[PDB]
Amino acid sequence: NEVKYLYLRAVGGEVGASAALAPKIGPLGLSPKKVGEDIAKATKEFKGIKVTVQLKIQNRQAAASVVPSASSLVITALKEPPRDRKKDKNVKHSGNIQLDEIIEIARQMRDKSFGRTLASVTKEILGTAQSVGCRVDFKNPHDIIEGINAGEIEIPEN
Amino acid sequence: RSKRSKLVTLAQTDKKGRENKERIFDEVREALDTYRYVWVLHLDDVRTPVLQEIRTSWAGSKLIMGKRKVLQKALGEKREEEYKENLYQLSKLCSGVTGLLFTDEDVNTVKEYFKSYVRSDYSRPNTKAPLTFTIPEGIVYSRGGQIPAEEDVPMIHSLEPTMRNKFEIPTKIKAGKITIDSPYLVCTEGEKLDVRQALILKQFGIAASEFKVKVSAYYDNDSSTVESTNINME
Amino acid sequence: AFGPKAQRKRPRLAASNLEDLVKATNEDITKYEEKQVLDATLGLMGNQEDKENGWTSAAKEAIFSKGQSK
Amino acid sequence: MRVRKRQSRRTSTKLKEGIKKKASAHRKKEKKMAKKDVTWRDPGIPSNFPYKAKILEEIEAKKMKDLEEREL
Amino acid sequence: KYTGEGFVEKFEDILKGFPNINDVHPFHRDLMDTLYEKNHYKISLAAISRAKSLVEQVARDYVRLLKFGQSLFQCKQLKRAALGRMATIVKKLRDPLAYLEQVRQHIGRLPSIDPNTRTLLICGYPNVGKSSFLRCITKSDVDVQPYAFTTKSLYVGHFDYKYLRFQAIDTPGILDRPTEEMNNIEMQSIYAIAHLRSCVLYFMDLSEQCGFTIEAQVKLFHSIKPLFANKSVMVVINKTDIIRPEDLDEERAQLLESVKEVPGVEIMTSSCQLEENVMEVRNKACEKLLASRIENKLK
Amino acid sequence: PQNDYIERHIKQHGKRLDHEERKRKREARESHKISERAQKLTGWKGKQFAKKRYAEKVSMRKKIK
Amino acid sequence: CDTQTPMHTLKGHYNWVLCVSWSPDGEVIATGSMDNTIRLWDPKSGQCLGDALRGHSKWITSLSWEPIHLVKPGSKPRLASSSKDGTIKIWDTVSRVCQYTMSGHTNSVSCVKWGGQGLLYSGSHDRTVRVWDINSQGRCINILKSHAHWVNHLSLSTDYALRIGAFDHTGK
RNA sequence: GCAGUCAAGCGUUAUAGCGACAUUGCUUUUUGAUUCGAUGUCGGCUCUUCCUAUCAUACCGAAGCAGAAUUCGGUAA
RNA sequence: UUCAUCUAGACAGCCGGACGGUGGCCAUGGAAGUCGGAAUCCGCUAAGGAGUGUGUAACAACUCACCGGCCGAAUGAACUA
Ligand SMILES: Nc1nc2c(ncn2[C@@H]2O[C@H](COP(=O)(O)OP(=O)(O)O)[C@@H](O)[C@H]2O)c(=O)[nH]1
Ligand SMILES: [Mg+2]
Numbered sequence A: 001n002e003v004k005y006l007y008l009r010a011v012g013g014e015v016g017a018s019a020a021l022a023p024k025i026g027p028l029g030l031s032p033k034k035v036g037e038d039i040a041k042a043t044k045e046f047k048g049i050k051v052t053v054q055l056k057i058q059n060r061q062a063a064a065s066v067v068p069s070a071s072s073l074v075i076t077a078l079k080e081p082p083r084d085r086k087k088d089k090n091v092k093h094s095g096n097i098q099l100d101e102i103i104e105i106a107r108q109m110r111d112k113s114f115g116r117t118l119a120s121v122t123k124e125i126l127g128t129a130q131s132v133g134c135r136v137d138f139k140n141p142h143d144i145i146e147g148i149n150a151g152e153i154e155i156p157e158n
Numbered sequence B: 001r002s003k004r005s006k007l008v009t010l011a012q013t014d015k016k017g018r019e020n021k022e023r024i025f026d027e028v029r030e031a032l033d034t035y036r037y038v039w040v041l042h043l044d045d046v047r048t049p050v051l052q053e054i055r056t057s058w059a060g061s062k063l064i065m066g067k068r069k070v071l072q073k074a075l076g077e078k079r080e081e082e083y084k085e086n087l088y089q090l091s092k093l094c095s096g097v098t099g100l101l102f103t104d105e106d107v108n109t110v111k112e113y114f115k116s117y118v119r120s121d122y123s124r125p126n127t128k129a130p131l132t133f134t135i136p137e138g139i140v141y142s143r144g145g146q147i148p149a150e151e152d153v154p155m156i157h158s159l160e161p162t163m164r165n166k167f168e169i170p171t172k173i174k175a176g177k178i179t180i181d182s183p184y185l186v187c188t189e190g191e192k193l194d195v196r197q198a199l200i201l202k203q204f205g206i207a208a209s210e211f212k213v214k215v216s217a218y219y220d221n222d223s224s225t226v227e228s229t230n231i232n233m234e
Numbered sequence C: 001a002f003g004p005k006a007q008r009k010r011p012r013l014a015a016s017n018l019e020d021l022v023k024a025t026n027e028d029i030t031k032y033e034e035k036q037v038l039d040a041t042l043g044l045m046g047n048q049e050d051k052e053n054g055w056t057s058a059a060k061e062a063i064f065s066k067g068q069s070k
Numbered sequence D: 001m002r003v004r005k006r007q008s009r010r011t012s013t014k015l016k017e018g019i020k021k022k023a024s025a026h027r028k029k030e031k032k033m034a035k036k037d038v039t040w041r042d043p044g045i046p047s048n049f050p051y052k053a054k055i056l057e058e059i060e061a062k063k064m065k066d067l068e069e070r071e072l
Numbered sequence E: 001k002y003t004g005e006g007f008v009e010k011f012e013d014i015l016k017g018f019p020n021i022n023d024v025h026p027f028h029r030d031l032m033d034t035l036y037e038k039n040h041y042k043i044s045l046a047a048i049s050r051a052k053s054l055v056e057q058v059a060r061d062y063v064r065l066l067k068f069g070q071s072l073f074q075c076k077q078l079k080r081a082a083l084g085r086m087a088t089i090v091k092k093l094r095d096p097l098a099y100l101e102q103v104r105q106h107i108g109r110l111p112s113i114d115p116n117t118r119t120l121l122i123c124g125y126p127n128v129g130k131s132s133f134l135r136c137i138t139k140s141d142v143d144v145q146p147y148a149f150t151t152k153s154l155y156v157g158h159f160d161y162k163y164l165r166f167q168a169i170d171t172p173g174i175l176d177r178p179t180e181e182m183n184n185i186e187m188q189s190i191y192a193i194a195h196l197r198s199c200v201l202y203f204m205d206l207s208e209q210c211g212f213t214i215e216a217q218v219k220l221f222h223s224i225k226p227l228f229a230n231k232s233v234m235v236v237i238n239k240t241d242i243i244r245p246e247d248l249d250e251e252r253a254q255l256l257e258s259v260k261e262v263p264g265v266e267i268m269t270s271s272c273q274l275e276e277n278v279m280e281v282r283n284k285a286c287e288k289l290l291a292s293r294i295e296n297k298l299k
Numbered sequence F: 001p002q003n004d005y006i007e008r009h010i011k012q013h014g015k016r017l018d019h020e021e022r023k024r025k026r027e028a029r030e031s032h033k034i035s036e037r038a039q040k041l042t043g044w045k046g047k048q049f050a051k052k053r054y055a056e057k058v059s060m061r062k063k064i065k
Numbered sequence G: 001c002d003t004q005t006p007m008h009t010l011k012g013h014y015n016w017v018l019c020v021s022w023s024p025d026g027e028v029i030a031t032g033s034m035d036n037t038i039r040l041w042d043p044k045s046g047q048c049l050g051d052a053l054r055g056h057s058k059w060i061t062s063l064s065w066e067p068i069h070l071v072k073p074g075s076k077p078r079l080a081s082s083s084k085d086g087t088i089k090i091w092d093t094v095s096r097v098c099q100y101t102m103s104g105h106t107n108s109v110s111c112v113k114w115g116g117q118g119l120l121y122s123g124s125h126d127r128t129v130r131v132w133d134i135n136s137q138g139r140c141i142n143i144l145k146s147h148a149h150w151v152n153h154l155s156l157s158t159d160y161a162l163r164i165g166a167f168d169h170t171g172k
Numbered sequence H: 001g002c003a004g005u006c007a008a009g010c011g012u013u014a015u016a017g018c019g020a021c022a023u024u025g026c027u028u029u030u031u032g033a034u035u036c037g038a039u040g041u042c043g044g045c046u047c048u049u050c051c052u053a054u055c056a057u058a059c060c061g062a063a064g065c066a067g068a069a070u071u072c073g074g075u076a077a
Numbered sequence I: 001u002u003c004a005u006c007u008a009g010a011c012a013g014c015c016g017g018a019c020g021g022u023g024g025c026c027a028u029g030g031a032a033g034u035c036g037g038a039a040u041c042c043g044c045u046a047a048g049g050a051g052u053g054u055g056u057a058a059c060a061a062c063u064c065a066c067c068g069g070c071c072g073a074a075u076g077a078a079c080u081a
């Protein structure tokens, strides 16, 4: 048998998020209810945060897992309160993330990274944090990157 | 008056000047002293993810690209202008899209890696056909019969003028779907491919050809000799 | 507000609920029916039916406009 | 193919003399505005002149000579 | 005077052509309010009317002044002043004119819906088969696609049953949201259901290939329940070629009976591949509508 | 027809078979046409053409700046 | 004001000092500036307390203090700040950090007022007034929508008492 | 029209003085509501020709121009 | 006339590359560079915009900004008369 892979964006913890996968389910003869249930069961860790979900199909089964992403990892490590779209809109991600958490995200992202150094991966993750608009070490992420490039900040693993 | 008026674009990137050529020149002449083996690699029609995977797999070494004349001038074009003794042979051995691999590993290890590295690729023009492909009769789908049409999604209508004019494929739009009256054979296996057929295969997403780096030769720093490698030069 | 670059996707003042929406629309329909009945008492009996048979009232005589010259 | 009327280019005496008076008045007005107006009042060697280097060397040697000619 | 008359004739052609939003039938009033933002609509037309009045005033003033001009230079200056003031007034109309041109182009292509004729309204969740059923029963060319909100505006079709012309209305799908977070696309369907006295056909998919569960579809029905009061109502279970109400689970069957329990609705099944069944459900809806209208007119 | 029927028609049937080529050749001929208009238009239309050309060139210079 | 003479000049900021506020116990001066910064001052010495509070991307529009009667004894009141970027940031001055950044508004926040029942009322140019609960980790409890244009100001019934704290017209 | 703003140029070693194109204020505010002093020459009828600055007729181009109808434009008396 | 590019490769063309974090954040029924609002970073580079337009319901595909291969000697821009 052959293995089929799908990739989608879904809000974690929410059932009925597989409505966009109905064109995918159509030719595949799958069950939309069970596909959505598996997506929710996989994304129980991420509450109210958009995440990249991988669906694996072999023979007649359905496996769901969560692919790590830089922005999703930054938003999760931000430890923001859960939000319901009927209650919170136009939310800003402007919390504080410590450098140890940034390095941990870089570790979770090093396996599929083209950076030759954990410092390079850390600078990429810091750029993503700058994009999401949060603060790192109570400082601007680009300023943290500038300090790293000057060498006042040292990445432990070499 | 009466001259062609150049198009003006408002983009965010400017062109590179002579300073970038000088910078790559300096980097080559420094790496010549830093590393011990200098390998000449032919990398025509290589994709950037493949090149970046190669750079990653050779971490700790240097892979330098750039203009061939710039690389040859940095290595020294002639005997009286070469950076190191008997480097002009390696310099003149460069051709085409040339990369230089500055490394410190064993000759056997570099040879083994470049002999064992292969990836699937799009078929280029003026290459042998890796298969015989035909668009099936009826509605044209995105893969064109490689995967079953039930899984496959029909070709978007916006590609019909491209298929009709650029690829010269007889197509008609029926109910927003691209249809052909008869099956259309694109290429027969073992046949030299032109730009049109290569474009059709690339459009349908067929990647049956193989990619492999060519290795011309290498130069040893202390031995000051060049040895022809002749890797994947068939 | 409207067009290729419009950014309004929601009504400015939404109805409180479907019950309010249906009640207001029923009242609007009743007011429209009464208003159209009231104007059908006169205008449709007069001006509108003249065009159906092609009848036109004759021209206003220029004598009735005396006392209104510049 | 219907051809229209063409403007005559035969000189008119009255127009010619009137233009003479017009031009004299214009020149007098321009001169008056020039005497009235308050507006504040060396391309060098051409890039295509072949002996630019000789011209520059001669002007530098002239400057060096003139520097001491007046002093002594 | 001639320039003033030209501007006045252009402005009058604008003002006479455009509909009167407060004098049209309330269904059309609500639809045009959703489509074009009634406040902006009336403000733009009022700006045109104000420009017309100002141009007339400028022409009258400068003709009266020109009666006392003493030379070609002064008379020419007065005429240039009048035309320049007219040009300034017209230039101040730049935004409303562009808005009204977009409105005219869009409003010329709206379908013609008669709010007082025989109507079959088609409504439900996205991807339940509304457009497919409209295609099956009329010759309207509404596109049918396996993604949500292919239909972004009301579509109309026609048919004949017992020597009477009936119109059918396909609507964009409705999500189960409160009115405050409901968007204009859904407002079209909501206003259609609220205004058009009709036979409302609520479509249900039990295969959930629309992307919504049976519980969600029943919730949507019971939520839009206040909308179809004093209107004939039927529930059409589409896509029976995949799954039938007979072979549901027990709780879902109880939910279907819960939908049925509300008077005086009636449940019928359909497949868009069953020409006999789509014609039968159409005939039943038409019978209900005709019985209701005749019972109304007989009183 | 109703709603965006020309867009739906293009989606379901395409355009005329020479549409792209004809439009491309018209755009290529535009430079010759603009020069011909500038040298051939007379009187009020010529003065308006020169005025509009000057305004467009000023606008382009401001956008580049 | 006794001699009608200047006493202290506070020159920490880099742009226009848009808002000033005095602590309701009368101990610290908070100044919110055009350069998106909030600076605290000791008035007796005319000095700057540490460094500036940062985190706003747009200029400070209004300042509010936590009421004394809500503040537990032995601790100092917190400082609420609003800005053109549409956020309300809450600052702990004892540790000089930012605890919450409420972010519901979509346009410039005109004003923020800290009430006497543990709530914050925020008014913005998005025609809305937001009621937030500080006890519930800075979440928006209510959205009041009845204005057809910008809200420019708001006032609470207890605003005089909240600003005055424990002091009086005798100032004991 | 008056008052201003911008700035391609003009100007110049004294960021003075000119200044095209663009632009704001007043005139003139929001829900399509609701006649004011020609101081001195005017008009018919019959009949001919000329201009084009084209209303119709001919042929074209553009437009959400489906069709029908219309609008704007070109050649054209 | 004044600036620039140029046999360690001029302009024009054809071909190839045009990447990775990443579908960056908010917002939307949907919105992945390309309806919008704010940031616009980091890495790997020969170079490659949090994207110049075509396009899609959203993706895709194409494009051009930029880089390289072939070709081989002048070329481009703004001003003045
Ligand atoms: N099996 C089956 N599929 C259907 C039927 N009707 C519609 N569909 C599919 O459902 C998808 C959406 O249908 P559509 O008419 O667009 O539903 P709408 O969104 O409510 O208008 C289409 O891809 C159809 O192929 C039916 O009767 N049986
Ligand atoms: Mg539909």
Ligand SMILES: [Mg+2]
Residues within 6 Å of the ligand: none
């Ligand atoms: Mg003419």
